[PDB]
Amino acid sequence: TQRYYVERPIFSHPVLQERLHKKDKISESIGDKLKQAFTCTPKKIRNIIYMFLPITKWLPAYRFKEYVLGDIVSGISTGVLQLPQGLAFAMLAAVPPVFGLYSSFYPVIMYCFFGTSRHISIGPFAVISLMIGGVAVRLVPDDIVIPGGVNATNSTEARDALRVKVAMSVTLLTGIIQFCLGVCRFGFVAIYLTEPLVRGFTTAAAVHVFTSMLKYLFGVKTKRYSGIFSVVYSTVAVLQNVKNLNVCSLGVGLMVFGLLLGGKEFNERFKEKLPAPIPLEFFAVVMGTGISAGFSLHESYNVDVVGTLPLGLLPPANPDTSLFHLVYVDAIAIAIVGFSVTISMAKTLANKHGYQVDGNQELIALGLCNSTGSLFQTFAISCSLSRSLVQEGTGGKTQLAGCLASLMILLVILATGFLFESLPQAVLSAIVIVNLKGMFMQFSDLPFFWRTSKIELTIWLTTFVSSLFLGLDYGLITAVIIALMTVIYRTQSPSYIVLGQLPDTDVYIDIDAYEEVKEVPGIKIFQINAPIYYANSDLYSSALKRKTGVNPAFILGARRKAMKKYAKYPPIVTKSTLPEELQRFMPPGDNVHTIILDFTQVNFMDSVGVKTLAGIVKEYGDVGIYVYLAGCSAQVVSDLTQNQFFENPALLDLLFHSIHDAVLGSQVREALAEQ
Amino acid sequence: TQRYYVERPIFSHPVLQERLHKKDKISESIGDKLKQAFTCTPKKIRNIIYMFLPITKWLPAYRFKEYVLGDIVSGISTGVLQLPQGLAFAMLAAVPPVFGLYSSFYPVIMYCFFGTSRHISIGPFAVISLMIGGVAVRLVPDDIVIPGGVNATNSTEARDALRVKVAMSVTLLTGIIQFCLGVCRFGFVAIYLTEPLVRGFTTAAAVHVFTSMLKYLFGVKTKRYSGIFSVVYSTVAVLQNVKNLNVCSLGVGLMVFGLLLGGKEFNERFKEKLPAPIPLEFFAVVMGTGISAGFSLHESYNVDVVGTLPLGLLPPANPDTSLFHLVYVDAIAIAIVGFSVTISMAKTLANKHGYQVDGNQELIALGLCNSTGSLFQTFAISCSLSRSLVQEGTGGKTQLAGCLASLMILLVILATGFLFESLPQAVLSAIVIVNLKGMFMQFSDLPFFWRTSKIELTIWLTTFVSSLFLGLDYGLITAVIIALMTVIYRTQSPSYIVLGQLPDTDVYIDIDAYEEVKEVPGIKIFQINAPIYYANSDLYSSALKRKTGVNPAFILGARRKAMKKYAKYPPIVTKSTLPEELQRFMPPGDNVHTIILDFTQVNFMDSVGVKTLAGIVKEYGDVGIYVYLAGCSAQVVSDLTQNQFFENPALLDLLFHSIHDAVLGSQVREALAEQ
């Protein structure tokens, strides 16, 4: 009507090509673009400093008026949750518990200096601690009888110190690997961690942490498992040793568990203006240690206890390097899983607040944290998932909440430690299990991805199962590979639709979707929303033949049967005119004379796709049906040209700019044929 | 001009949707389509019989007049090449050589009954024989001293028989696995074997066969290697034991090698009308055995010899099944690699002649061949690559060439065998090495895929290297995974191009490609030829901001700096009109008022892509720039709707049917704004 007036000639490929002339587009010194900048410009230097060491821009652009309160409250809460988590993951690392406080202190300040994620908290992260403990057990097994010299009982201090040394070596190697990956721009790999992949992976990690804390909650001594089917073995071992437990350890653990669930529900449900997310975990830990000490619980009823915490800050003893030959593989595994968890949580919390986390810079910061921690008697670190959620939800505006947690841990390690000596391990297990609630709430993503899109649900469930039953490392690798497989599947099951023309317009849409579209007579239009490549070409050809209802093989068979019933410079022609007897013995099907293949949606093709297109064109030409490509893009035209599809026959004339151009060209030649 | 006259109203999404009404499209009993056919129709029964047991259609549709000559000549040549190849692969399987003739006899007739590939020959295929020999060595090592009873020298017959039993068990398991995969429609996986993948894999297999035949060519006894870096270990072992060789074995081997190369060049170069591809290999083997016997070569100069061939056809002794517990994994590996090689060669020879090979039916036929062979004292089988090329090139029109080879092997095993007793292993090694020439000629694909397309070259080289250095099994798996990774890369590096309008038409093409396209004033058009999904969204957004030259963040910064210099039911609005002071202090850039995102090429999106589009629209709306989606397909519109992108705001009005519709709608609203 009033608008959209075109009045333009028929643009086949040769017409549009002769209409317009190419440009130069060849810029000089291309491919060596970054060689010739290398400048000492102040802006570039400040940008590099901002990118490597972001605290140069964190501090000056600080907003006191509200961030002071936000970070104060969030840091208080996150350090409160940090102390018991650090202790529990330390005792789970087969390392004396104070090294958990060291790991909760040093890497936090190092990340503050070098990290970019606003809402993140850095600590032991029990699965990393599990791998560290498995390595320590492997290198320093329990049965080792060392000639100490005093000829006394087999004190565990020597074995514990050897395990600590193993932890130092492996964590230093992970730090070095992480830094080396970070400088070499490996953080780009963090783009393959989808949202459902991250959700499933973190939920599997939460299930791992739960099944790990089970054995301390029950007060049961069981053999430590690590590797593949680790969670299954841990759970079955706990259930096999469900007998001979410690009834009082369960009593205190479940008591603090129930009171802590009640407190969390009280604190979340009854949210008001002035009330803040009270530090429940500190109350839990102080009541637990008070009950344990007042009732002599460790010596009366034989409950497992944290034990003695050697006070003071130890000097930076340089670690050994001769255990790398034995720990390189598990150092690689620890570094990979730590980076994956850190970037996954930093990204899923950056999505909520709209800021960009550089995966490479996260990797560099995490590696430097791990290395300096190894220098300062610290095992490997990562992002604590539950503490990250707690710091985010409480309103941590900057990294200063992490700093506040670090200084509270510093207070615990310098002044106190007399106090938390008599603390049941059940209290720590209950605290960790309760704080896994934020991770466990991610199971609501199953109905969501069921309604929204089942490919994302498949990614979620596959990541969850693979990451739960295998380790987080192998589970993560297989989950990423399968998430990438989903794209191949999505290009392997396209939507082949036959198009029909909206009357007296140029709009071509699905014939069997809107009933106001009547396909133009004697023309069939095919349309695939996928690239035509090796994993897709045969399906595309078969679908064309099936859906258009025009199979050249059946047509040739019909010609042969009709003939049977009748018994009563280059030499190139791309179109064999039909030498039929001009009879009706063939089935009275449609009299289609051309087929238009819509390549607007076809992103690319490779050699197999071009071969199958040559086959399609040749077959339909042999039967007597023209084939037109419509809307071929420059990428697709180049992919057709590189392969020997245009040996300059009248094949460059089969291409048209759009579907309507192809329809009009076919109608024009059909009218010309009647002349 | 004369044609292409549209004269149609502006079709935004709501206008086109209200113009036309949806159909039903809901067919009854959908999703259970194959439940309600289950017919005894004669056509369906004959189709099923043709599909499972194709010899029912091979024989009746046979064309004597030319296929008789073709199959006669091709069968003669292929059986001639079959005999020495069978013997060599048998002695390489750590199995006495006659079982090579059994393997060359029974599975060939079984495949004739059940196989679909016209141009294929079935035999031992030295790498499969290598895996079989490795399994036999593992289960029956050389050092085993069995109490035979005669208390004589440690005769190898008992050890050889135990190795044969192991071969029986493993090949029966491979046959069962292959059949079970074939019935369960596993042959669809053969669609992921690209052309370059197949070429690289078969060239790596040829290199494997060459390095395997080296040690028999040199007459050197070396430890057998199998597994990962197998070829490297075999070659380094041969070169380490390059000393203490057998000079006469090398003499005869290189003599027949040179004469055979000369004969092959004579036979191929001097091709004429009446001359046929003479059976060179039979002359080679007969001269070799004549020289070995006449000069007493095995006992005079100590050359390795084929040995005695126990005459006659052995009865179908049923194999044991208690070795499955030990050989299941290598049976799976053998079945996978055998199917991969068979389908790869059958497909690459079906491409030359234009006929379809059902991967599932190939798998079923190969499994039945392996199983019945295990019943008849046969080790595992596959498609011989060199013999497949020889049968194809000589002009094998049907499977009867395979039958002729099988009957010639039957003649060798029933009548002769007295003769080939004194045959040097060097002659067989030279024959195999010479016949690897067809596979080695595939190295010409490197310049071809260098000029044509470098993704295919990357697939070729990666498949070759991975399949050569790892085994064919792990190499094949990694090659397939990387070939699928290339599609992810191809969607991760699209061609972002800014479009410009061809004057007074509706054709929009690249601005910096043709210099006759002038972009419409105050509009920027962006265009990606890729899906917008998780691995692609951030790159797409950054590329839009960079290439269009319109970054909302820099624009907001410019507004803030201008303000600084000045110091001298639902509540939804998708477009924040600019509250500027109406001043020029901002940089004098373009005054773009809308950005049109071309989604014609966008095949699909997932949750991450829809999130980044919501972000893009929100950002540009906040700055004061409209964003229009142009050409969204039904798949993309559904992907936008499932995710909460249309919460029925004026967002369903941002979609337009085509680029020109979006341009005209933006110009219309801009004109209306001036009112």
mmCIF file of C-alpha atoms in Angstrom, chain A residues 345-495:
data_model
loop_
_atom_site.group_PDB
_atom_site.id
_atom_site.type_symbol
_atom_site.label_atom_id
_atom_site.label_comp_id
_atom_site.label_asym_id
_atom_site.label_seq_id
_atom_site.Cartn_x
_atom_site.Cartn_y
_atom_site.Cartn_z
ATOM 1 C CA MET A 345 30.444 -18.504 40.362
ATOM 2 C CA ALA A 346 31.988 -15.129 39.500
ATOM 3 C CA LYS A 347 30.081 -15.154 36.208
ATOM 4 C CA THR A 348 26.760 -16.277 37.696
ATOM 5 C CA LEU A 349 27.043 -13.502 40.289
ATOM 6 C CA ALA A 350 28.211 -10.954 37.714
ATOM 7 C CA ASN A 351 25.086 -11.650 35.650
ATOM 8 C CA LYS A 352 22.894 -10.454 38.526
ATOM 9 C CA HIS A 353 24.664 -7.076 38.749
ATOM 10 C CA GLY A 354 25.849 -6.481 35.177
ATOM 11 C CA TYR A 355 29.636 -6.273 35.226
ATOM 12 C CA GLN A 356 32.300 -8.115 33.252
ATOM 13 C CA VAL A 357 34.775 -10.518 34.860
ATOM 14 C CA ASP A 358 37.887 -11.207 32.806
ATOM 15 C CA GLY A 359 38.396 -14.964 32.910
ATOM 16 C CA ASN A 360 42.096 -14.518 32.205
ATOM 17 C CA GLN A 361 42.460 -12.036 35.057
ATOM 18 C CA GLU A 362 40.522 -14.323 37.398
ATOM 19 C CA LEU A 363 42.914 -17.116 36.445
ATOM 20 C CA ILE A 364 45.977 -14.920 37.026
ATOM 21 C CA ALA A 365 44.711 -13.675 40.390
ATOM 22 C CA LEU A 366 43.793 -17.180 41.524
ATOM 23 C CA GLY A 367 47.198 -18.502 40.485
ATOM 24 C CA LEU A 368 49.049 -15.758 42.337
ATOM 25 C CA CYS A 369 46.873 -16.383 45.399
ATOM 26 C CA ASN A 370 47.668 -20.101 45.326
ATOM 27 C CA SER A 371 51.396 -19.538 44.784
ATOM 28 C CA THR A 372 51.828 -16.975 47.562
ATOM 29 C CA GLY A 373 49.703 -19.138 49.842
ATOM 30 C CA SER A 374 51.999 -22.078 49.156
ATOM 31 C CA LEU A 375 54.807 -19.739 50.163
ATOM 32 C CA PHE A 376 52.811 -19.004 53.347
ATOM 33 C CA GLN A 377 51.670 -22.534 54.329
ATOM 34 C CA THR A 378 48.333 -22.674 52.520
ATOM 35 C CA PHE A 379 46.678 -25.445 50.522
ATOM 36 C CA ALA A 380 44.791 -24.897 47.269
ATOM 37 C CA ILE A 381 41.900 -22.439 47.101
ATOM 38 C CA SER A 382 38.851 -21.653 44.996
ATOM 39 C CA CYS A 383 35.561 -19.788 45.236
ATOM 40 C CA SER A 384 33.403 -21.037 48.082
ATOM 41 C CA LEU A 385 29.938 -21.354 46.572
ATOM 42 C CA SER A 386 27.870 -20.966 49.744
ATOM 43 C CA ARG A 387 30.029 -18.116 51.031
ATOM 44 C CA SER A 388 29.825 -16.424 47.634
ATOM 45 C CA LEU A 389 26.033 -16.538 47.831
ATOM 46 C CA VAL A 390 26.098 -15.285 51.425
ATOM 47 C CA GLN A 391 28.406 -12.373 50.580
ATOM 48 C CA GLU A 392 26.301 -11.471 47.533
ATOM 49 C CA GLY A 393 22.914 -11.688 49.249
ATOM 50 C CA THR A 394 23.976 -9.786 52.368
ATOM 51 C CA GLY A 395 25.018 -6.960 50.034
ATOM 52 C CA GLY A 396 28.765 -7.106 49.512
ATOM 53 C CA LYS A 397 29.448 -4.119 47.291
ATOM 54 C CA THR A 398 33.232 -4.473 46.900
ATOM 55 C CA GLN A 399 36.144 -6.745 47.821
ATOM 56 C CA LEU A 400 36.410 -5.015 51.202
ATOM 57 C CA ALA A 401 33.929 -7.570 52.532
ATOM 58 C CA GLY A 402 36.576 -10.142 51.665
ATOM 59 C CA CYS A 403 39.138 -7.981 53.445
ATOM 60 C CA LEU A 404 36.908 -7.857 56.527
ATOM 61 C CA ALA A 405 36.611 -11.641 56.494
ATOM 62 C CA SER A 406 40.398 -11.881 56.181
ATOM 63 C CA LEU A 407 40.972 -9.601 59.182
ATOM 64 C CA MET A 408 38.416 -11.489 61.271
ATOM 65 C CA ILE A 409 40.260 -14.717 60.454
ATOM 66 C CA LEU A 410 43.453 -12.868 61.381
ATOM 67 C CA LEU A 411 41.881 -12.046 64.743
ATOM 68 C CA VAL A 412 40.973 -15.713 65.178
ATOM 69 C CA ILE A 413 44.513 -16.838 64.339
ATOM 70 C CA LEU A 414 46.427 -14.198 66.335
ATOM 71 C CA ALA A 415 44.349 -13.600 69.473
ATOM 72 C CA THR A 416 41.842 -16.439 69.879
ATOM 73 C CA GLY A 417 42.336 -20.151 69.237
ATOM 74 C CA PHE A 418 42.345 -20.919 72.930
ATOM 75 C CA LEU A 419 38.561 -20.788 72.566
ATOM 76 C CA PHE A 420 37.750 -22.893 69.489
ATOM 77 C CA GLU A 421 40.006 -25.707 70.712
ATOM 78 C CA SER A 422 37.000 -27.637 72.062
ATOM 79 C CA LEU A 423 34.667 -27.514 69.070
ATOM 80 C CA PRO A 424 32.931 -30.666 67.777
ATOM 81 C CA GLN A 425 33.471 -31.458 64.123
ATOM 82 C CA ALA A 426 29.729 -32.117 63.974
ATOM 83 C CA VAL A 427 29.056 -28.395 64.443
ATOM 84 C CA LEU A 428 31.211 -27.569 61.416
ATOM 85 C CA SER A 429 29.570 -30.322 59.373
ATOM 86 C CA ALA A 430 26.110 -29.017 60.249
ATOM 87 C CA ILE A 431 27.108 -25.432 59.423
ATOM 88 C CA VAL A 432 28.408 -26.443 55.995
ATOM 89 C CA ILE A 433 25.391 -28.647 55.260
ATOM 90 C CA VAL A 434 22.957 -25.876 56.208
ATOM 91 C CA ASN A 435 24.805 -23.313 54.110
ATOM 92 C CA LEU A 436 24.557 -25.598 51.080
ATOM 93 C CA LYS A 437 20.873 -24.469 50.878
ATOM 94 C CA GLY A 438 21.573 -21.720 48.349
ATOM 95 C CA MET A 439 23.230 -24.197 45.999
ATOM 96 C CA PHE A 440 20.465 -26.746 46.557
ATOM 97 C CA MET A 441 17.782 -24.203 45.632
ATOM 98 C CA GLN A 442 19.148 -24.374 42.069
ATOM 99 C CA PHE A 443 17.123 -27.564 41.552
ATOM 100 C CA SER A 444 14.202 -25.287 40.654
ATOM 101 C CA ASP A 445 15.861 -24.964 37.233
ATOM 102 C CA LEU A 446 14.379 -28.309 36.138
ATOM 103 C CA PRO A 447 10.754 -27.162 35.645
ATOM 104 C CA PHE A 448 12.059 -23.866 34.252
ATOM 105 C CA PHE A 449 14.221 -25.488 31.587
ATOM 106 C CA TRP A 450 11.474 -28.051 31.024
ATOM 107 C CA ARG A 451 9.014 -25.351 29.987
ATOM 108 C CA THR A 452 11.543 -23.055 28.312
ATOM 109 C CA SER A 453 13.789 -25.277 26.185
ATOM 110 C CA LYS A 454 14.655 -28.947 26.558
ATOM 111 C CA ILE A 455 18.155 -28.650 25.090
ATOM 112 C CA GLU A 456 19.121 -26.461 28.043
ATOM 113 C CA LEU A 457 17.442 -28.975 30.356
ATOM 114 C CA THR A 458 19.455 -31.775 28.748
ATOM 115 C CA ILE A 459 22.636 -29.753 29.277
ATOM 116 C CA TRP A 460 21.667 -29.122 32.906
ATOM 117 C CA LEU A 461 20.874 -32.752 33.709
ATOM 118 C CA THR A 462 23.853 -34.173 31.825
ATOM 119 C CA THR A 463 26.226 -31.762 33.560
ATOM 120 C CA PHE A 464 24.694 -32.589 36.939
ATOM 121 C CA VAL A 465 24.867 -36.372 36.522
ATOM 122 C CA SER A 466 28.301 -36.455 34.876
ATOM 123 C CA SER A 467 29.775 -34.026 37.404
ATOM 124 C CA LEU A 468 28.203 -35.858 40.341
ATOM 125 C CA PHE A 469 29.189 -39.413 39.461
ATOM 126 C CA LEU A 470 32.547 -38.675 37.877
ATOM 127 C CA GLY A 471 34.697 -36.034 39.536
ATOM 128 C CA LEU A 472 34.154 -32.342 39.019
ATOM 129 C CA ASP A 473 37.100 -32.365 36.602
ATOM 130 C CA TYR A 474 36.051 -35.202 34.287
ATOM 131 C CA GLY A 475 32.422 -34.260 34.841
ATOM 132 C CA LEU A 476 33.144 -30.691 33.784
ATOM 133 C CA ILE A 477 35.057 -31.789 30.682
ATOM 134 C CA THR A 478 32.324 -34.174 29.532
ATOM 135 C CA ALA A 479 29.633 -31.607 30.342
ATOM 136 C CA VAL A 480 31.372 -28.994 28.182
ATOM 137 C CA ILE A 481 31.818 -31.473 25.332
ATOM 138 C CA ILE A 482 28.151 -32.503 25.476
ATOM 139 C CA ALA A 483 27.008 -28.878 25.661
ATOM 140 C CA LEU A 484 28.952 -28.327 22.447
ATOM 141 C CA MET A 485 27.398 -31.514 21.020
ATOM 142 C CA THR A 486 23.981 -29.925 21.509
ATOM 143 C CA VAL A 487 24.848 -27.330 18.847
ATOM 144 C CA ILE A 488 25.758 -30.110 16.412
ATOM 145 C CA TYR A 489 22.438 -31.785 17.173
ATOM 146 C CA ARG A 490 20.622 -28.486 16.683
ATOM 147 C CA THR A 491 22.168 -28.174 13.222
ATOM 148 C CA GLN A 492 21.458 -31.867 12.551
ATOM 149 C CA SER A 493 17.689 -31.607 13.158
ATOM 150 C CA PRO A 494 16.685 -28.361 11.440
ATOM 151 C CA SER A 495 13.178 -27.246 10.514
#
